[PDB]
Structure formats: C-alpha cells, structure tokens
Design a protein around this ligand. Sequence first.
Ligand SMILES: [Mg+2]
Ligand SMILES: [Mg+2]
Lengths: 1341, 251, 270, 50
Amino acid sequence: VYSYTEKKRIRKDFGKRPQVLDVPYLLSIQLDSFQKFIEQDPEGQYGLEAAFRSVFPIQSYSGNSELQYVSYRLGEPVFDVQECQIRGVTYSAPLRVKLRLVIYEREAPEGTVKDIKEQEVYMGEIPLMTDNGTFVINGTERVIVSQLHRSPGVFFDSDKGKTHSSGKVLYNARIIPYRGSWLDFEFDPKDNLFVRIDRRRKLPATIILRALNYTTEQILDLFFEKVIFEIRDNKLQMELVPERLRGETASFDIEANGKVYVEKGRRITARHIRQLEKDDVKLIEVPVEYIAGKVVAKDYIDESTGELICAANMELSLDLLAKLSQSGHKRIETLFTNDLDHGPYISETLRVDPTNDRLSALVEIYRMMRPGEPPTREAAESLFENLFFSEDRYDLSAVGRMKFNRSLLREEIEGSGILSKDDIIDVMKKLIDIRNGKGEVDDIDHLGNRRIRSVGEMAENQFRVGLVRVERAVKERLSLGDLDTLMPQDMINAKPISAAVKEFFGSSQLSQFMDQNNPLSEITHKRRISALGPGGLTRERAGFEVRDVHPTHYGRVCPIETPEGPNIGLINSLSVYAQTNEYGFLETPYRKVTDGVVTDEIHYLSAIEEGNYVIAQANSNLDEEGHFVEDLVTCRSKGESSLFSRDQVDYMDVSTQQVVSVGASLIPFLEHDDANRALMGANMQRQAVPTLRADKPLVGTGMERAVAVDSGVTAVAKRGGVVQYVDASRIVIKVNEDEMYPGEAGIDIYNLTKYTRSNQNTCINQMPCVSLGEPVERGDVLADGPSTDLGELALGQNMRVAFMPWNGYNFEDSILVSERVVQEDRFTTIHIQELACVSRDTKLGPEEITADIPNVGEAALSKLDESGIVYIGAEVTGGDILVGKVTPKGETQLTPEEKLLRAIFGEKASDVKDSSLRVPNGVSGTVIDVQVFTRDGVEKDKRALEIEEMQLKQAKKDLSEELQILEAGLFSRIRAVLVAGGVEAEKLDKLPRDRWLELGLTDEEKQNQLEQLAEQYDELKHEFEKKLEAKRRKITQGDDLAPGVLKIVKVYLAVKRRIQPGDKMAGRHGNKGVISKINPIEDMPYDENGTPVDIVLNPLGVPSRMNIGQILETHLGMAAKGIGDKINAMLKQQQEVAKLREFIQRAYDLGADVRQKVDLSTFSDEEVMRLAENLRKGMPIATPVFDGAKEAEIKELLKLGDLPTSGQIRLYDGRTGEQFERPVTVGYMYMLKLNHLVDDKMHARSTGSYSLVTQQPLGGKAQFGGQRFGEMEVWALEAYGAAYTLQEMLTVKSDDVNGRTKMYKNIVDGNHQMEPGMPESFNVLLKEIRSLGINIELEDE
Amino acid sequence: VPLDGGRFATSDLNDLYRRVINRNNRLKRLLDLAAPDIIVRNEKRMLQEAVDALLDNGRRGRAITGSNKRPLKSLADMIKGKQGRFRQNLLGKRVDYSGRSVITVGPYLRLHQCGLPKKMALELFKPFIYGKLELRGLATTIKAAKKMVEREEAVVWDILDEVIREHPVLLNRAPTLHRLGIQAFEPVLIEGKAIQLHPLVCAAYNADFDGDQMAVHVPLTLEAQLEARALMMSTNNILSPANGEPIIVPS
Amino acid sequence: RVLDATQLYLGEIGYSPLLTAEEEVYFARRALRGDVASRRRMIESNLRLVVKIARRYGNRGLALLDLIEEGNLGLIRAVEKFDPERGFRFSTYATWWIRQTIERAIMNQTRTIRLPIHIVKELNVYLRTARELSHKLDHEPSAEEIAEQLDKPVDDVSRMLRLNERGTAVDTPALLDILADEKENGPEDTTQDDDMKQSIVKWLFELNAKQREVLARRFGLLGYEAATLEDVGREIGLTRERVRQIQVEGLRRLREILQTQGLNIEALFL
Amino acid sequence: IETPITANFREGLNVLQYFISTHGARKGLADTALKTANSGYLTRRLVDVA
DNA sequence: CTCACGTATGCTATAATGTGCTGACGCGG
DNA sequence: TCCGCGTCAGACTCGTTTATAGCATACGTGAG
RNA sequence: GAGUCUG
Ligand SMILES: [Mg+2]
Ligand SMILES: [Mg+2]
C-alpha cells in the first residue's frame, strides 16, 4: 500500500527495524508553544489569560477606584504575510481588551454601586506566527529560538574545593523561583549555616528562622534529636538509643544492668549494638564528666526563684549540672550531636547569631537589603513578607513548585507559588543531610534540571512586563483624577506594551533572521535550543562541563550538531522524536516491555523518569511478535550501559534514529563517519544552495521526504481529488466528494510562489509536481519547493566521482571538476538581490527621482523610462543607473578651476547633484521586478501609477477567476443534486446557468442541499465585491514611511552564477573543498565505456579524516546508478512491461533482511512505466542512520548492476589515452555547492575612503576596506628585516594623511619614494591622554 | 555627524561632557543663590560623580548606562582596552593596497610565484598603471587614465602586465603565528577570482584549500620591494627559523 | 558602607524638621522680610516634597538626583514668591514651581540637539492626539491622520516628528569605523586636483598674453580675488563686452588644447 | 571512559558507541576554540618581553 | 529704522513632605 | 576582597523607547 | 554592541 506520489518513484529501503512510530511534525515545538500563548483558555492560565489575571485587577492606592479585566480579542491582521513582506511591516493582530472601571464610595464602607464603565481598549499589535513557524518583523522572516534554562525549584550544589586550599567541600542550597528574589543557604569552612537573600551580604541561617517567629528551643527541636539525662539518687543516668553510639569509640566503661558491654577506649562494633538493643537497654549509668560539653535543649529555670538557671542551647558544665539537680530537675533534654552523621551545625550557628528575638532578626534582614535606612517594625515585617511571602512579587510557578516538592521527596506536586515556613526548613534540613553524608548534590547539566522555554512562554513574559509598566501608570491616574468623568482608555497607554513586545520580537537575541539557504537550514533553525540570551548563560560564563554531551541528552538532544565556534555546546539541535513535557522538560518515546514481550504501547519519559527504568537498545533483536531473541539484552539504566536478563528489561528505544537530530539523520553512512566530521557535514548541509535543477539524492536515508513535507516549502494537498488545472503559477484541484464538505464549493486553489528573494538572497521558486488531470490523496506533494525533488529533499546534485590524484589539482581538499558539470548547468545557482533607492527630504529640499540627471550618457538614460526607473527585463551591469535620483545642493562656492570648467561646458545642470541608485560594481543581472512606495500626500510618479494599473487589473482577474471557478464548481454540484430526484439532463444544460435561482425540486433533504448551494453562491457574490474593494484600497493606499522619506523604489535583480574556481563545495560527510580547475571533457579520466568522470577528489582526504561514509556512499551510489543504467537501457529498447517488472521486483526485494516489502504486481502497467522512467536516472536507495546498508548488500546490488564488487574500475587518462596502473574507486557522491562563492569574497583596494577619527582606511568589502595589518602580521616583519615595509604599513598606507597623498603622487610620477610623516592615530592618542589631564609632551632633539 | 537617514550620531564623550557642564553650572547657580549646605553638598557629590564618569567610567562603582543600558565609553576606555587605541589602531592598522580572496592550488607555479586574479591586480596597482600610462603618453592625464581603466581597455591589460613584472606581492594568512605566515612572491596574472598558491609553501601558511583566504599587500617603495625580494621571498625562506629543518617540504 | 551619593543625600533630608501650618506662616513672614535661618529651614524642611515629585519623574530624561537638584531650584523660587497672607497652604503653591522647573530642565538638557520649548510644546499636542487616535484606530497614527485632527499643515507635523527622532551613541550599537570621513578626499581625488592645478600653470603659458591675463584674474587662478565679467575692469581691461568676448576666446582655444591632448569628452564624464 | 569502542569505522559504530565517541570529539572541538586563546596570550607575553 | 520672528524666562495657590535590578567564569598577585 | 589578564584575521544581518500644562511678558537679532 | 558563519 503506497501513495500516488510514491508510485511515481519508490526509494529502496535497506532498513530492517520496523518503525512502530512515524517521525512527528518537525515544526511541532514552535506551533504548539505560540498557539498556547494566543489560545483563548477560560481556566488554563496560558499566555494572555494568565497575564491579565496575574496583574489585574489593579486597584487604586486610595482604594476608591479599580480596573478589572473581562476578556481580550485579536483583530484580523491588517496586511497578509505577502503585503507585510513587500511593504516592510510587522505581521500582527491588534489586541482589543475589554476592561471595567469600577469605583467604590469612600463614605460607604465598600459600596460598589457608584460607577461601572466598561469599554474595549487597544493595547498594541502582537506579531503572529506563520503556519510555517516564523514571524515577519519589518518585512523580514525571523525565527524565535527556544531557550534552555535552569528550572525553577531547588538546587543543592557544592564548590568542589575552589575556596580555601584547606580543600573543604562547602555545600549550598539555591532556591530559584520563576519570579522573585533568590534564596541561598550555604556552609562556611567552620560549619556555620549562612543565608544570602538575593546573593547579598552573608547572614547566619538561624536569623531567618527568628524572622519566621522561631524561639531558640523550637529551632533546636526542629534540627536536633533530643537525648534525655535522668539524675537518679547520686549517679548520673541517660536514656540510651542502642545505635546512636554506632561507629563511635567508648569514652567510659558502658555497664548495663550490672554487666559490662563496652570496654572503655574501644570502638563499638555491630555485635555490641545488637546485644544492647536485644537486651532492651533504656537507662545506662554514666560519669558526671561526660556531660561537660553536652548542649541543653530547653530553658531550665529554678521553680523557687523563677529565674533562668541555663538558657536554651547552652554548653553544660559540672557546676550547672549540680545547680540544676538541687533546684529540683532530674531530667535534662540535651542535643544529640555526634559529629559524622549528626553534626551540630545549627547549634553553632545560633552562637554566631547576634540577634535575639523575631524583631531583632527582621531588623537585621531589613538592614542588609536597605543598609543605612532606619528600621521600623512595620517596614521590616512588610519587606520580609514582600520578599518570599507575597503572591505578587514571588511565584515559583507550577514547574517550580513541582520540582521543589519532588526534590524534598513530597507526594503532592501542585501547591502555593509562595514559600511556606515549612518549605524553608525542609530545604535547610536537606542541605544539612547532604553535609552529614546521607543525600546527594543535584547536577546542573542534567536535563532533569534544564527546562525548555519555546516562544509562547517568552512572549507571555514580555507581555507581563508591558502590563506591569501599565499598572504603575493606571494606579497612578486612578488615585489623582476625578473618577466619574474619567474613563479607562485615557489612563491606559498602548505604547509601553507594544514597545515591550516589539523589543522581544525585534531586538531580542533569540529573534534572528531565519536561515533560509535551504529547507533543512530552515527546519533545523526552527528546532534550535539556545542556552544563551536573556535569563541564560554567556560565552564568558560558559564552562566546559555544560558544553559537553550529558548522558541524559540520549533521545532528547543531538550529540552531533552544535556550532563549531564560541557557541560550541550552548546551542543544540533537538533530537528527532524528542518533545516538550507539559512542564517544559524534554522527553523521548520508548516502547513498554511487559513480561518480556515488547508492546507497541509507547511512553514519553522525562529525563528524571528515564533514570529509574532499564531501557533496551533499539538494535536489540526482537523475536517475531513477542519477546527478545537473545537472553542477555544490551540495555542502559542509571545513565550507563551493559547486558541484562530479559525479565529485568522494562522498556526499549523506539527508533535507531531517536538519538540523532534532523540534520544528522540525512547523513547516510553516519555509522562509518567520525563524529567530528559528521558534525561539520550536518552543519554544511545547511549551507547548501539550491541549484537550478533540484536533483534527488541517490543515496538517501528516508528522512528526505519527511523534511521536505514538514518544512512547509512544498505545497501539500489537504483535500486531494483530481487536478482540474495546472499552471506555472497556480494549481486548482477538484476535491473528492468523501472529504468535500457540502457547504462551500469544493475546489481547492494552491497559488504557487514564483521566483522570490530569500534572506540570504538565494532563490525561492515553487514548480508544479503533478500533471493536468492527476488523482491525488490528502498529504500528496502538489508542488516542489526550492530544494526538493518529487516530495524528497534535494540539497544538491549527485555526480560521478573518482578518488585519485591529478597533477596536484586536488592537493589539499582542492577539487577537480569536469567542464560537463558547468555545461549541464548543474550547480548553476540563482541569486535574487533587492536594491532600494530612497528619496528623502533634506534641509535644502526634496530629492527628485527624475531621468533628468546632470552629467550622464545617453547610453545610461536609454535603459531608464520616463519616470527615471529601469524597465522590467533589462539586463544590467556595474555602474548602470537603476533609479535616477538627484539631490538639491546648497550654493556651491567653487574652486576657480570648477568655475572655469562649469563655464566651458555650460553644463551648470541647475542646483542639483547625482545620488542615483546604480548597480554595485561587478554584480550583473536582469531586472525581474520593481516596486514603488510613495507617501499619501505626494503626487505619484508616472511609473508608480502604471504599476498600480497592473496590480489593480491583475487583482480583478484573480478575484474574477475565483468567483468563476467557484460558481462553475458549485453549479456542477447543484446539477448532480437536481438529477438525484429529477431527471432533466439535456433540459437543464440548455437554459442559462445564471437563471437557476428559480429551479428547485420537492421538499426533501435534497431541496435543503439546493438552498445551501444557493446561499453560498450569493455569499461568494457579495464576498467578491468586498474583497475587490479591500484590494483596491490597499493598492491606492499611500504608505507611511520613515520621517524624511518621500518615496522608495525597490529594484529586484536576478543573477545567474556559474560554478567556478574558488567556489566552495562539500559532501554530507563533512568533506569540503575549493574548486581548483575546470578540466576539458577530453582531459578527464574515462571508463572502458568512454564515459568521463565528473569530479576527481583526493584519496588522501579520507583515511586522515576518518569519514568512511563518503566511500560507502560512492560504492552504493555507483550500484544505484548501475541499476538506473540497466533500466535506461531497457527503456531505450522499449522491451516488455513483464520483463521490466521482473528485473525491478528482483531489485527492490534484494537485501538479506530487507524490512521494506514491494509486492510489485499490483502496480498497473502505466504506473510501472512512469516509475521506470524515474528510476532510469538512477534507482534511489535509503540507508537509515544506524540501520543502514551492509557492505555485503552493496556488493550484491553491484552484481545486479554488472558492476565490480570492489567498486573500483579501470580508468584511462583523457590526456595520454594510457590506462591508470591500478583500479580506481568510482561512483556517485551527492555533492553540495555551499553559499561561500568566490564571487562574494574576492575584494581588492588601492586607495579609498578613510575613517573619521583614526583616519585609517575602513574595514570590510561593503565599505571598500583595506585588510587589517594586525599585531601578528606586524611581528612577522619585525622577525624579518623588513623595516620600510612595516613603516609603509603604519604610515602612508594607514593614518599618515599628507604621506599617503604625497606618496600616491610619487607613485604616479614613478618615484617609488616614501617621504613618511606622523600617524594621525598617535596625534589622537596624545589628545585623549591630555583630556585625562596628563601632560604628555614631545621633547625635541 | 549626520547619517544618510537625516539622523545624527555622536560620541558618548559628548553625553559625559554635557553631564559635567550641566552639574558644574548648576553648582555655580546654587552658590550665587547662597543655597543651604545639604543641597550644595549633593551637587558637589554629583559633580565629582560626573567628572569621574567622564575620565574613567566603571572604576568609581556603577558605570553610567546610556541609551541601550550599555555603560557610556569614557576617555580612559578609548585608550585602555585591547580595543583601546594601542592594540587596535597603533600596534596594527588597516592598510591601503591590500586585498583578499579564496586560495586554490597552482601546481604549475614555481616556488617563487603565485596566481593573482586580473581584476584584483588591476585595482591594487592603480597608481603604477596611471604612471606608466602618462609616460607612454597614452593617457593625457590622471582622470583620463582612470576612465581608461574603468572601461578596462585592451591596451591597459598590456600595461598592467608590464608593471607587475618583477614586482613582489606579500601573501598573508591568519593566523600569522610565525614570520613565514607572510611571504613574498612574484605574481602571475590569471583570469578568475581565486588566488593560486604554490603547494610547497602551504606548510608554512598552514594553508589547506577548503575555503581558506589570503591577504595580498603591495610593497610600494623600491626599499620595500627589495626587502620583499631579498628577505621575505618564498625561495629565500626555506628553513624554519624555529628549528634548522626545511619548512618547504613535499607532502 | 553607605557610598551612594543618592542614599547619602536622602539620609540628610530625612534628618530634617517637618513644618506645620502656623510654623510655615511664622517662618514665611520672617523669610520674605529676609531671614537667613527662616529661608534655610523652610527649604530644608520641604526637600521631602521635591523628592515626591522627583520620584514620579524618573526614566524620562535626567537621573533622579538630576531632577532632585533641578526640583530644589523650584523650591527656592517657591520660598522667594510665597504669600503667607493668603490662607492657602505652601505645599500646594510649591508643587507648581517644583514641577515647572523639573519639566523645563527635562525639555532642554535631555536632548543632545537642544530642542526649543516652543517646538516641544507643539510636539506634546501631536503625541497626546496620536494616543487618542491609537485607542480607537487599532493601528498607530499616520502623519496625515494627526494633521487632519489638529487642522494643521502636514509638512509642519512631519518636521516635528522628525525632530522626535533621537540619536544613539555612534560608539555604542562599532558604527564609527563603518562611517567614512566625507569631508576628506581620497589621495586619488586629491592627486587629480594637483594634476589639474599643475596643468593650468602650463596652460597659462601656452595661450595669448592678454587671453590668460583676464581669464585667470577673473576666476582668481593667478590673481588674488575671484572677480566677475564686469569687475575685471578694475585692472586694465576696463570693459564689459571686450572682457566677455576675450574670456570665452581664451576658453575656446583651451577647449581645443584639451581635445588634442586627449581629454574633452574623456574628462567630460568626470 | 571505562568501556572502550571495540568496533572500527569500516565495521560501523552502533548508537551507543557513537554517542560515547561524541564526548571526546566535542571536547576536542571546544578545546580548539577556547584553549587557542591561552596559547596565543603566551605568544604575546613572550613577544612583548623579547 | 521699525516690526516681526525666534527664543526665554515667568507664573499658576485644596492638600500632597522617606527612595528602591539581576545574579554564575577562573587563575594570580 | 579586588583587579588584572583571556589567538589572529575575515562574511553577513539587525538595531537605535518614554511621557513631559498653557499663556504673557522679556531678551535679542534679522529682514525689509 | 546581539547575531549565524569561514578558516
Ligand atoms: Mg582549511
Ligand atoms: Mg581542516
């Protein structure tokens, strides 16, 4: 069972592992997230609903007035994506919000029966996400990259040494909210617990408990176990807990009953402990000297006097014991604190704590955050409560509370966003447990602690900031104003919210120009995760541990896709099957294994859930519809991998591909490639420019089709049915009755995007896939995007490649290409460049866009038309004028020479200059399109007006054809309904279709169908009118531009660039090269058959590189093409459909254990010859990643092609005709032309403009810049002799102003003499040091 | 200075000077007005804050943030940092008669030669062309010589061929770790946009042709030409200055 | 560790006495009569009020301290022109003065290019109008839409909104190195002017003796001052027609000297 | 790492061997970006001194 | 020689009088 | 606790928000 | 300055 577009061309699958779950929608993250932000939920606080309920209702400081939120609504977008992109505006919806101003009486207690004013106010336009996953901001397609941050909750960490060469591990807890101040607990080398509020100055940890109203004895009862001391008769006794001693050394002779258990001065082993516990020991007699040092728990006072004998937490002595006895206390609660397991930390922290009561603690906290400002009690209570116990300033969020509760081993997930007194103590408890040795530190790099924020969360946050700024303004105006005249909209400002959101979608680091070189570039960019930007790491901050692959990255993050650069490890591509859990942790699918049998039940497990189960590997062999074949299966748990028995196995990897990301999944024999080279391979696939002819990959993986479809660049059929009309512009499909709804007319129109500019100035062109009158299903590819073959992703072009040296023309990765490649226009690439000409208004006057330009040849003005605009279709070259522009010059006081010169030619040419937009030098192209943007008030150019005439008439035609095809399609249905119960075939066709409003039939369900079709017809009739009025308004609409700007003319050039020496090419195994020479066909190594090789690559760039994938790709590529050459031969000789069918079935069903079955037969003869015609230019094969083709399968395929098993062939030198002395590996490598063309990089400069302050030449080719002569380059001249070359570079070549002109004159005069001076940079340095008030003088000879 | 857009752009020193002048003049005012001393003090604190921000911003505690939030660049900041003036504009500079392009092999070359693209060399030797053009009397003046080059006339190629003869050009590759990261060659004019490098020197540059680029520099003076031909020529720098061994080694 | 200039000043203000009604009247009568202590105490006691207005005037132009100091200047003028005879309170009168001086300073100092209060006041009305338009028009105000509402000239509205365009630091997001010196000519252009100026001297000693004595003394090439056709008469020519015939006769023979040397149309483009 | 990679590139790595390879690979690549700075800083200190 | 034009300093009276981001690099002296 | 360091060039793109009474006399230079 | 890159 294959789909229609697959019947045209089937890829042979060498995969063996049946896929239980298909690749999901790849642009799932961006769409779900943003959809949640705009999604209207009444309850589920997501995006805007949450944002309003959080801030609102805002009540005044006086408390008379309050503003409350009702609901919001997004207006429909003013401009479609198309008009936004052309005009250079943000694609957004207006946000209208219903708000109710309610007012209370001050005289009545809280009477709400005074004034309720409800109105719908504008607060900004919110940018909308495209169906593809992008935002159009100021006419540029941009993607907002998902972020990876430390999850709110608690984290227990520890400086592993670092501080104090003592080398003490100091443990710390950090409580991180989603919003609020951070709460730190930490240890000191002296084992004192400290609190840092908001990482300010240090305070003793106990101070925070005093602020929460804890007495000393209550604190001690919380952290410490009590030990009771009974004073009986004269001897001292204490209540023993059998274990407590445990691993201690007995300081006294321990006697129980009458009989001695411990010997004094010996270590108490397990036997002593079990003996004591079984004997039921509860009292033991002890010496008085053992209590010297024990800490009293409670306050003990003299019942006689009523004064304190000893305060809580006080070190006991022999005399305090005596005083306690004689007062009448024969029971003393003392702290259990035996070092080791139970450390006295809080006991020692209370002794360091200078504060006494609650107030004294609150004052000291207040004095830390606000040092200097005198305390008040109300101020200190307010500040402390407003830190972590205010609903408005503190919010852990659901994820914070959930991770917090799980870290403290709770049962309940959900709870308060504010910190409870219990929370803080539990955290301190766990900290101290970890110090004692029971309990462990959480890992920051662990994905269980790293959470994903996609768009909607981030848009939500910026939107809350906007609201908060508004709340101050609103509350301020509610208090000042009279309440009754004043309506809510005069208080609200839209500009703060609009500004917050604008700054996110435009200024933000995560909002970046979509990487649109090719479909894969786009799709991978939209599934990016960055640890950088706001609320994240910095390159400075970023260490080595975060960057490296973490164990938990398995199935969630790609290990082999990360920028090789400063961003190495902070930016991560998402894995294939990976997805975000409800809280925003990453999760991966796994097949449940029940009683050893491996079900199709599939569970997404988070990073933390994964640790708990044993997961079998995907390559683990299952036995035909039940359990594992092998007894000891290779699995992984607790983040590490080994053999397990079958009963132990809980789960298994869903696919072999789930570890890898999208980009790397497209690499065929990844299994045989070094991970480094593979990284650069996946990275260069993103740089691949789509060629003029999009060629499929012969050696693919199968992700090719998934990527092409999910990217959105292909037009895919929603409804299916039969194609009514193809055109190089549009596809109209007539829908099938089964999916076709009986309401609207059932004709789908897909308009194709023709040759349009990309962000990287590449070309975006959609061509139609299907022919006129082709039946198609839902999800069939209707039109191919730029780098896509019939549904599959086609980033470049496969080529006959031979590995062997040439005469050094492939020296270090250098590539030797045949002229045939250039001739066949393979790797010829299309670049559409957008040039704008801006007419501004200056102090002197407005600039004119006339063809009337001072000092210009008729050659130049020939190409400009009446207005001063180049004609459509005109070929242009550097220096040709595209849009003529002249600028008003104010009164030119001329040099006498210019007075003479202007007098001689009399070409005074008025008071005007020449600022015309001309083609940049060396770029050459054909003008494909021109756009004119004018202001509303200013009189339109002749050329602007004829452009609007075209757009108007074209609009009219488009809408007219809509209503015509929709009416024809709709009456074609009425015709079929009327036949149902009323045979009038020939009689209905004769009377006009326009007079069918009269026509009905008997009152049944079919009469109601006629009413549906009649109401739709008229609905479309008026709809067509209001659509046309909208179009006409937008075409006439004068655009509001930047201030100063009267009009703008945008010219679009089309440049065809040929492949050429210097151009950069690569494969998909990270194998790069620069083309060194284009060899004549005659010269290139050729086969016994006479067929020349296309590309000659260097053997020596393989064994060092350890990317063996390229060689396997080449052997299989030749085998693929071997079978294509057999099918090509059989199609040339027509032959039998039966015979073709035989060969092709034997071919598809070759592999030793091929998963994919192809029961050819069912294919009709017509389907088979269309299939062979596609297979002729080489049978496409799919080698999944880690489940790829085996060497033996490739050699078997080669034998089917009658090609050699070695995949090496005899080659003959094109030049000499003699044979090469040994066989050469030849086959087909799929090759890519990257964006790095020599055309764009070549630059040269003799003299140019110079910098403002430093007077040195500028940098960069765009500014016509000199190459930087850096410290490093200077030192080289210092090492040599070269003193004159160095001075040259310092002086006449850079700053020295007089020197450079004088030496220019000398070089034209042919003197070749320097005449050096003083570099202007140094003159500046002097001025800058004197500006500091340091006298720096030059002292003369 | 006025940007093209009609807008202006200014140094942050102007914002810091304006701070200092406003507060200083306000201090003069409050002294003329005999203000109470608490307010005089506040103004004297603010004046010292403004001068300290102007001299060295960020040293006296929290630096004064301008328009974005980024701290204003003060006087000391223009001298101090690597980016100051020392490392950036003085110990190294941007340079005239300098170009770059992708490198590619020239196996046909001899050790002392390099393929230099026609259009690149045309531009780098512009004054040398102007000069020969006027000595042959083919160009009446400089402006006419410029327009003859712009038109890229056939006689100009022949003159350019004549100038480049025996004129050495410096090739440089980043990073320049040791002195052989700069070498002089005699250029060979070639059609096409890529620089052609001799294989045997690829070792010294650490040049592999998978897209690496090189800087070209023209030694102008007779002295600089001679220092390039004698000291810096490829042929003359065969042994590594680090160890005695030949750097020019087949691979 | 109180180091901050702001927190120091606000500490000093808190340390002041707060005034009542009868106390304000007593000090105010003595203050206008010219008491030293009365003026100082009224100022120092009312500093807290300046802070209140200065607090709700931050993040608009100057810093809190800057506004606090300028606001203090308003306090002084308030104490100078206070009327204790009127039963109405000081706080009410002072609030006007403090807001006036702060606003005025914020309109002047804030903007790098000093914008006059006249234009600033007009700008106020344009922007308030834009806000009311934005609330009802879901989109933002156009220049023409604002102009329609105020019944004012489109050009005047555009000039105003242009002046609103703020300039960011060139060194800050560098731009300095992108932007070239437009006033400085490249050595290429400067060398071309040298060639022209040198050729002129040689061209002056190639024509007639009376054809380069009135052609150069007019343009100011050899002479000292650039005269006109009528002003060449001051030397020896003393003619208007004969000066204009001879000026152009010098240029016609020189036009053929540039056609033969090989410029004319060659040096016409340039 | 205590478990070595038994296989070679001709044989092909499995998912676990490849994932384990990545660690060394990426640390190598990050080393070239980050460590180059200290090498170069040493060159510059040496140059200034001599 | 006189007025308009551009720019600036002036005054207004219910009472109101105390502030307020981002955190985390790592080695040496 | 503070302050000082942390390779060398190259390519491109983006980007420059905020609210601030109205009106009368006074001070000063330019244009007709 | 914040980017994504090429050595
Ligand atoms: Mg390299
Ligand atoms: Mg390399």
